[PDB]
Design a protein around this ligand. Sequence first.
Ligand SMILES: NCCCC[C@@](N)(CC[C@](N)(CCCCN)C(=O)O)C(=O)O
Ligand SMILES: [Mg+2]
Lengths: 296, 296
Amino acid sequence: KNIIIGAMTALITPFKNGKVDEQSYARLIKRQIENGIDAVVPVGTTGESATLTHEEARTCIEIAVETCKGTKVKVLAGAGSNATHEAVGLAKFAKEHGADGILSVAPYYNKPTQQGLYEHYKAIAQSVDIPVLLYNVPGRTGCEISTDTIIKLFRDCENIYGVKEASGNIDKCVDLLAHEPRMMLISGEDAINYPILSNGGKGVISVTSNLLPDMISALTHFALDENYKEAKKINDELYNINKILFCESNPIPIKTAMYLAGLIESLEFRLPLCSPSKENFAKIEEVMKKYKIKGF
Amino acid sequence: KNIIIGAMTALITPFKNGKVDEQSYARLIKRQIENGIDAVVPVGTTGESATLTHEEARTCIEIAVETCKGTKVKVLAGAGSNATHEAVGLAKFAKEHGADGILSVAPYYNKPTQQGLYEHYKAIAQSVDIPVLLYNVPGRTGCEISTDTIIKLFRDCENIYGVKEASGNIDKCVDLLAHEPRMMLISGEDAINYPILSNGGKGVISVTSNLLPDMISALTHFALDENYKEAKKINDELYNINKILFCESNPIPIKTAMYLAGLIESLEFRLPLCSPSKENFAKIEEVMKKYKIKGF
Ligand SMILES: NCCCC[C@@](N)(CC[C@](N)(CCCCN)C(=O)O)C(=O)O
Ligand SMILES: [Mg+2]
């Protein structure tokens, strides 16, 4: 199987006067390349994929693919949908626009059954050639892809090579890798990056990496080399910022943090997302000064 | 305030060979009108709105408004989105195809804050003239509209006239009606229709109504006319079907029940929605036996 692993970033999408700041986007992706990141994930949840237009989603994949040409950094494009026909289309679009793979979230809101989740992902898997990473975040979708369904898709569809887990469920990650160790388990929960990697996970898709890509990079590569003491040390150091980045729903804190660090020009969200409270803004602003934040 | 209350049916959307069976849709809406229903809710969650085309949604609103012209049956249009710019659009569309009001679900997947939910709904309400009923289903959206947020929206925006609660939280509906008793609290949870009505709720938006519209009608009117004994009597009898209609995610069981009752032609879903298990199929078909099913 073809795979995409290592330290990966769920890219924020900066806005300037309500439009996608394309030059900011490219500069942030380059900031990622130059700080040890192995792959960038455009138009995911952290990128406010829900409120983007298809030309903006398609444009930001193109910006990512183009910025990454000439590097080992791969483009794992966000291409999920709660409608199978749209998820297949976005998989085809990313594949035809140069993405090295796709990250496909479980259908949200319409709560498909385990049988329905299998047929949904098989439809995507059979529709394109690029690797496909399952994305399970039940707290946002209303549904979970069970361990059985994840393993079945990994064994039945060749392009499906693993799953980004944001389940806060270390038991499920044992369960997953204990019955199918050839799968690529990706951490979708920054605070528990090391515990997931330590059990055989082969990478992370991080929100924290947006601000401190060097430390997320170092953590993952320390861990992949089984230097578990150094990997755990960064994990422990990162805990305060890993948590504070979820004082409010992602990506409200990270974009607040990016603005505070001067890495984006404006603190703009598309509704229903909005700037955090004044309290959390102060909490985000304080925890930051305990970390060394890289620039461009 | 202009309001839309009473017994309401979240219409299933029949498919024939992958297309919206237009006549059956109209034929099913007619079955509702002649069975005591006060309003029909097209292209909601129960209508598989997530996997519908704008051309399918638009036609089903048009079919809905046209079939209830001349009766007193209202059209409460499903018009929700996790992107405010998409939700504002659907509100205008629904107003121009003749809908008497819109049901607008809380944004799903992207988990907006209470502030974001206020600005999201304030943007919709300020965009149309027709009544706006908030829809809270945290198990499907990943988010809850707090009681404070609900009441603030009710008091600040003239068309926002209440909320359809599907939280299994009778506590919250006391909280709602005790602090804002002028609000129209609508049941979105069939099994607890009477307990919500018994505390001052003024209607239901029912799944069970698809199969037994005569009994959902009678329950709602008995309760609104303060015949609580007869209202609970139907509620208690309906429990077994009210539960089995969620043996799997709605609208999978109700479409199964509708098909088994011969009220629709094909048992077709749009993916990731799926036919139920053979086990649950026997459970839906068996519980059904016990009720007297209206025909055309
Ligand atoms: N990158 C584009 C994202 C926009 C799509 C959408 N806002 C809503 C998705 C949708 N399937 C659209 C349905 C439109 C009417 N059938 C949904 O709301 O369910 C989401 O996935 O969050
Ligand atoms: Mg090495």
